[PDB]
Amino acid sequence: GPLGSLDQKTFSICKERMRPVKAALKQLDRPEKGLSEREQLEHTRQCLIKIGDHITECLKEYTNPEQIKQWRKNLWIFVSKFTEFDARKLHKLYKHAIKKRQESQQNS
């Protein structure tokens, strides 16, 4: 019924999607400590949006409502393991970034 964790397949799938964004997601587990305050401020957003936008584009790949909805949580869960930020925070924080910045574009 309710399970927990991620399936063995589903685990491999998120690994394969989180290829280019490895730097950003790993910086969310273990941030940098040798930069400025203003530096950190841009840094965390540039990480966050690149992850969350690659998540977004990974999920527009699928067509079925089942898939786009399930992967819309699966990828957030996977990334959330690599940070202090729960998927309840991360989605909200990502939203704040994209919304504020008014970036979104198409076909990036």
Domain residue ranges of the chain, discontinuous segments joined by +: 1-108
What's the sign of the alpha-carbon dihedral 43, 20, 62, 65?
negative
The letter for the amino acid at 92 is K
Q: Give pairs for 22-29: CB < 8 Å, separation 24+.
A: 23/47, 24/48, 24/50, 24/51, 25/51, 25/79, 25/82, 25/83, 26/82, 28/79, 28/82, 28/83, 28/85, 29/82, 29/83
Method used experimentally: NMR
